[PDB]
Short mmCIF file of C-alpha atoms in Angstrom, two decimals:
data_model
loop_
_atom_site.label_atom_id
_atom_site.label_comp_id
_atom_site.label_asym_id
_atom_site.label_seq_id
_atom_site.Cartn_x
_atom_site.Cartn_y
_atom_site.Cartn_z
CA UNK Z 4 -257.02 -46.78 -31.49
CA UNK Z 5 -253.70 -45.03 -31.93
CA UNK Z 6 -250.50 -46.09 -30.11
CA UNK Z 7 -250.61 -45.78 -26.29
CA UNK Z 8 -248.33 -42.75 -26.23
CA UNK Z 9 -250.56 -40.84 -28.66
CA UNK Z 10 -253.85 -41.72 -26.91
CA UNK Z 11 -252.49 -40.83 -23.46
CA UNK Z 12 -250.99 -37.55 -24.72
CA UNK Z 13 -254.24 -36.47 -26.37
CA UNK Z 14 -256.42 -37.33 -23.33
CA UNK Z 15 -254.01 -35.48 -21.04
CA UNK Z 16 -253.95 -32.47 -23.40
CA UNK Z 17 -257.75 -32.38 -23.65
CA UNK Z 18 -257.85 -32.29 -19.83
CA UNK Z 19 -255.23 -29.48 -19.82
CA UNK Z 20 -257.33 -27.35 -22.21
CA UNK Z 21 -260.47 -27.98 -20.08
CA UNK Z 22 -258.68 -27.00 -16.86
CA UNK Z 23 -256.82 -23.98 -18.29
CA UNK Z 24 -257.19 -20.36 -17.22
CA UNK Z 25 -257.50 -19.50 -20.93
CA UNK Z 26 -260.62 -21.68 -21.38
CA UNK Z 27 -262.03 -20.10 -18.15
CA UNK Z 28 -261.71 -16.79 -19.97
CA UNK Z 29 -263.33 -18.36 -23.03
CA UNK Z 30 -260.17 -17.87 -25.13
CA UNK Z 31 -259.58 -21.48 -26.30
CA UNK Z 32 -261.59 -24.71 -26.58
CA UNK Z 33 -261.14 -28.19 -28.04
CA UNK Z 34 -263.98 -30.69 -28.79
CA UNK Z 35 -264.29 -34.26 -30.00
CA UNK Z 36 -265.31 -35.12 -33.54
CA UNK Z 37 -264.60 -38.86 -33.96
CA UNK Z 38 -265.26 -41.82 -31.67
CA UNK Z 39 -261.51 -41.76 -31.83
CA UNK Z 40 -258.97 -38.99 -31.34
CA UNK Z 41 -257.57 -38.51 -34.86
CA UNK Z 42 -259.66 -35.38 -35.56
CA UNK Z 43 -260.59 -32.67 -33.10
CA UNK Z 44 -262.29 -29.30 -33.39
CA UNK Z 45 -260.53 -26.28 -31.91
CA UNK Z 46 -261.88 -22.81 -31.31
CA UNK Z 47 -260.00 -19.61 -30.54
CA UNK Z 48 -261.16 -16.09 -29.66
CA UNK Z 49 -259.80 -13.14 -31.64
CA UNK Z 50 -257.24 -11.36 -29.45
CA UNK Z 51 -258.28 -7.97 -28.00
CA UNK Z 52 -257.22 -4.82 -29.78
CA UNK Z 53 -257.02 -6.53 -33.19
CA UNK Z 54 -259.43 -6.58 -36.14
CA UNK Z 55 -260.39 -10.10 -34.97
CA UNK Z 56 -261.70 -9.00 -31.54
CA UNK Z 57 -265.22 -10.37 -30.88
CA UNK Z 58 -264.73 -13.14 -33.44
CA UNK Z 59 -264.47 -16.88 -32.81
CA UNK Z 60 -262.51 -19.13 -35.16
CA UNK Z 61 -263.17 -22.85 -35.65
CA UNK Z 62 -260.06 -24.98 -36.39
CA UNK Z 63 -259.76 -28.39 -38.07
CA UNK Z 64 -257.14 -30.35 -36.06
CA UNK Z 65 -255.80 -33.71 -37.40
CA UNK Z 66 -253.56 -35.71 -35.04
CA UNK Z 67 -250.95 -37.89 -36.69
CA UNK Z 68 -250.31 -41.56 -35.74
CA UNK Z 69 -246.79 -40.37 -34.75
CA UNK Z 70 -248.00 -37.85 -32.14
CA UNK Z 71 -246.34 -36.34 -30.12
CA UNK Z 72 -243.28 -36.52 -32.44
CA UNK Z 73 -244.89 -34.68 -35.36
CA UNK Z 74 -247.21 -31.69 -35.20
CA UNK Z 75 -251.00 -31.69 -35.55
CA UNK Z 76 -252.21 -30.60 -38.96
CA UNK Z 77 -254.32 -27.48 -38.40
CA UNK Z 78 -256.46 -25.39 -40.79
CA UNK Z 79 -258.93 -22.52 -40.21
CA UNK Z 80 -262.46 -23.68 -40.96
CA UNK Z 81 -263.71 -20.15 -40.21
CA UNK Z 82 -262.61 -17.75 -43.01
CA UNK Z 83 -260.13 -15.04 -41.98
CA UNK Z 84 -258.22 -12.12 -43.61
CA UNK Z 85 -254.64 -12.42 -42.26
CA UNK Z 86 -251.24 -12.39 -44.13
CA UNK Z 87 -250.16 -15.81 -42.73
CA UNK Z 88 -253.45 -17.69 -43.35
CA UNK Z 89 -255.05 -18.48 -46.77
CA UNK Z 90 -258.19 -16.40 -47.29
CA UNK Z 91 -259.36 -19.25 -49.53
CA UNK Z 92 -258.45 -22.56 -47.75
CA UNK Z 93 -257.60 -21.55 -44.17
CA UNK Z 94 -254.07 -23.02 -44.59
CA UNK Z 95 -251.63 -21.70 -41.95
CA UNK Z 96 -247.99 -20.55 -42.21
CA UNK Z 97 -246.44 -21.04 -38.76
CA UNK Z 98 -243.12 -22.59 -37.86
CA UNK Z 99 -244.34 -24.74 -34.97
CA UNK Z 100 -246.65 -26.55 -37.45
CA UNK Z 101 -243.66 -27.48 -39.65
CA UNK Z 102 -239.95 -27.47 -38.81
CA UNK Z 103 -240.10 -26.02 -35.29
CA UNK Z 104 -242.54 -28.52 -33.69
CA UNK Z 105 -241.21 -29.86 -30.36
CA UNK Z 106 -242.64 -32.93 -28.62
CA UNK Z 107 -243.20 -30.93 -25.41
CA UNK Z 108 -245.85 -28.78 -27.18
CA UNK Z 109 -249.50 -29.42 -26.67
CA UNK Z 110 -253.01 -28.74 -27.97
CA UNK Z 111 -253.15 -25.84 -25.49
CA UNK Z 112 -249.87 -24.23 -26.70
CA UNK Z 113 -250.82 -24.72 -30.37
CA UNK Z 114 -254.19 -22.88 -29.81
CA UNK Z 115 -252.42 -20.09 -27.82
CA UNK Z 116 -249.73 -19.77 -30.52
CA UNK Z 117 -252.42 -19.36 -33.20
CA UNK Z 118 -254.04 -16.58 -31.16
CA UNK Z 119 -250.61 -14.93 -30.85
CA UNK Z 120 -250.20 -15.19 -34.64
CA UNK Z 121 -253.53 -13.29 -35.05
CA UNK Z 122 -251.99 -10.49 -32.95
CA UNK Z 123 -248.59 -10.44 -34.76
CA UNK Z 124 -248.68 -10.93 -38.54
CA UNK Z 125 -245.45 -11.60 -40.45
CA UNK Z 126 -246.28 -10.19 -43.92
CA UNK Z 127 -242.72 -10.66 -45.26
CA UNK Z 128 -243.08 -14.47 -45.02
CA UNK Z 129 -246.77 -14.74 -46.07
CA UNK Z 130 -249.23 -17.55 -46.80
CA UNK Z 131 -251.58 -15.27 -48.77
CA UNK Z 132 -249.80 -12.76 -51.04
CA UNK Z 133 -252.79 -10.57 -51.81
CA UNK Z 134 -253.56 -10.10 -48.10
CA UNK Z 135 -249.93 -9.57 -47.25
CA UNK Z 136 -249.56 -6.91 -49.97
CA UNK Z 137 -252.55 -4.97 -48.60
CA UNK Z 138 -251.23 -5.31 -45.02
CA UNK Z 139 -248.00 -3.63 -46.17
CA UNK Z 140 -249.26 -1.09 -48.71
CA UNK Z 141 -252.59 -0.01 -47.21
CA UNK Z 142 -252.76 -0.96 -43.51
CA UNK Z 143 -255.90 1.15 -42.89
CA UNK Z 144 -257.84 -0.76 -45.52
CA UNK Z 145 -256.30 -4.01 -44.32
CA UNK Z 146 -257.79 -3.28 -40.87
CA UNK Z 147 -261.24 -2.42 -42.27
CA UNK Z 148 -261.26 -5.57 -44.40
CA UNK Z 149 -260.17 -7.90 -41.58
CA UNK Z 150 -262.86 -6.40 -39.27
CA UNK Z 151 -265.49 -6.82 -41.88
CA UNK Z 152 -264.50 -10.46 -42.35
CA UNK Z 153 -264.59 -11.00 -38.57
CA UNK Z 154 -268.24 -9.80 -38.65
CA UNK Z 155 -269.09 -11.65 -41.90
CA UNK Z 156 -267.54 -15.06 -41.01
CA UNK Z 157 -266.55 -15.17 -37.27
CA UNK Z 158 -269.57 -13.71 -35.45
CA UNK Z 159 -267.86 -10.44 -34.48
#
C-alpha cells in the first residue's frame, strides 16, 4: 500500500466522484485499475457546444507516492485534436498538473478542470504546435477536424 495519507485521500476522492452531481449527469467518472490505488482510469464527457460534444475521453491517471502533495500524472488515452493536448501521445499542458497543483485539489476537480480546458483552449501556450497553428489560422477547419476526431476516436 501507499502511505496512510495517500490511501485515505484517494478513497475519499473516489467516494466524492461517485457522489457528485457531475457523475449524476454522466460528466465525470473514475474507475479502479490495480488491486492498489496507484493507477486509476478517468473518463470525461466533451463539454456542450464544443467540437467534443457527444464524445467520451478515457484518461490514464497515475497517483504518486507523495499524494496529495504532488499532482496526479494524467494523459489522454482517447485521441483528441486540441491545442493543449498532444494529438500523438495525449500529453496535457495544464498548470494544475505542474507548478500550480495545490494539496486541496482532488480527482473530482482535476477531471472538471480537464473538461474546462476542452471548452477553453490556450493556443498561445500550446502542447501541440500543428493543432495550435490551425486553431489560430483556420478556426473553421480546426472545428471540423476536432469534430471528426470526436466521432473517429471518442464515440461522438
